[PDB]
């Protein structure tokens, strides 16, 4: 049971295995973050819901000082282990974004929240914590799925595995409402689009499927 979850989580970084689609999606998110935030080199960055560290590590490679948060024990161990093998320094912490926000307010140039909004009982609380974590003038990114989108992480690990990692879509309008109640200002939104025929992802207008939001403090 824990054994089964450990087996699945252990394949996180096989580029040609079951986590393939997550590795294909990442360069598009990384690219959007780097473009919208004006580079990651020299920046202090928080990845909220970092899983096995696909995004976290890709940001550290471009020269950011990255912290990864996840409440899921197993994925976080896999993140630590991979960073150890790769020689990339990333600080991975098992705590809630709320806990981290209470200890580290205003410390981060960039906050990314790319995976767990649609899985947590209180997404509004996540949005408020991310806003508290970022410096004045810093960037906060969200990524989630609309009603007709797909949670690719849940596609890979399954719904049961997600529930172990937490105490199923977010309307862009809901997200905008939550953002408006904070010091964050929405700047840009884009769709993350998937072609089932060629199995390719791309960014573009239209947010009926998956989407990413750029905000600034």
From Swiss-Prot:
Its EC number is 2.1.1.222, 2.1.1.64. The keyword Transferase applies. It catalyses: a 3-demethylubiquinol + S-adenosyl-L-methionine = a ubiquinol + S-adenosyl-L-homocysteine + H(+); a 3-(all-trans-polyprenyl)benzene-1,2-diol + S-adenosyl-L-methionine = a 2-methoxy-6-(all-trans-polyprenyl)phenol + S-adenosyl-L-homocysteine + H(+). Its main location: cytoplasm. Pathway: Cofactor biosynthesis; ubiquinone biosynthesis. GO terms for cellular component: cytoplasmic side of plasma membrane; cytosol; ubiquinone biosynthesis complex. One of its GO terms (biological process) is hyperosmotic salinity response. S-adenosyl-L-methionine binds at residues 29, 49, 70, 114. InterPro entries: SAM-dependent_MTases_sf, UbiG_MeTrfase. GO terms for molecular function: 2-methoxy-6-polyprenyl-1,4-benzoquinol methyltransferase activity; 2-polyprenyl-6-hydroxyphenol methylase activity; 3-demethylubiquinol 3-O-methyltransferase activity; methyltransferase activity; phosphatidylglycerol binding; polyprenyldihydroxybenzoate methyltransferase activity. It is found in: Cytoplasm. The keyword Cytoplasm applies. Homodimer. Component of the Ubi complex metabolon, which regroups five ubiquinone biosynthesis proteins (UbiE, UbiF, UbiG, UbiH and UbiI) and two accessory factors (UbiK and the lipid-binding protein UbiJ). Belongs to the methyltransferase superfamily. UbiG/COQ3 family. This is Ubiquinone biosynthesis O-methyltransferase.
């Amino acid at each position: 049971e824990i054994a089964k979850f450990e087996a699945v989580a252990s394949r996180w970084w096989d580029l040609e295995g079951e986590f393939k689609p997550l590795h294909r999606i990442n360069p598009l998110r990384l690219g959007y973050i780097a473009e919208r935030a004006g580079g990651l080199f020299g920046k202090k960055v928080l990845d909220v819901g970092c899983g096995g560290g696909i995004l976290a590590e890709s940001m550290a490679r471009e020269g950011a000082t990255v912290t990864g948060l996840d409440m899921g024990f197993e994925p976080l161990q896999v993140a630590k282990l991979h960073a150890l093998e790769s020689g990339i320094q990333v600080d991975y912490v098992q705590e809630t974004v709320e806990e981290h926000a209470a200890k580290h307010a205003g410390q981060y140039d960039v906050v990314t929240c790319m995976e767990m909004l649609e899985h947590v009982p209180d997404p509004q609380s996540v949005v408020r914590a991310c806003a508290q974590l970022v410096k004045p003038g810093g960037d906060v990114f969200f990524s989630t799925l609309n009603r007709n989108g797909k949670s690719w992480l849940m596609a890979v690990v399954g719904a049961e595995y997600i529930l172990r990692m937490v105490p199923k879509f977010i309307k862009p309008a809901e997200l905008l409402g939550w953002v408006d109640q904070t010091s964050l200002k929405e700047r840009h939104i884009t769709g993350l689009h998937y072609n089932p025929i060629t199995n390719t992802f791309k960014l573009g207008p239209g947010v009926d499927v998956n989407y990413m939001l750029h905000t600034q403090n």
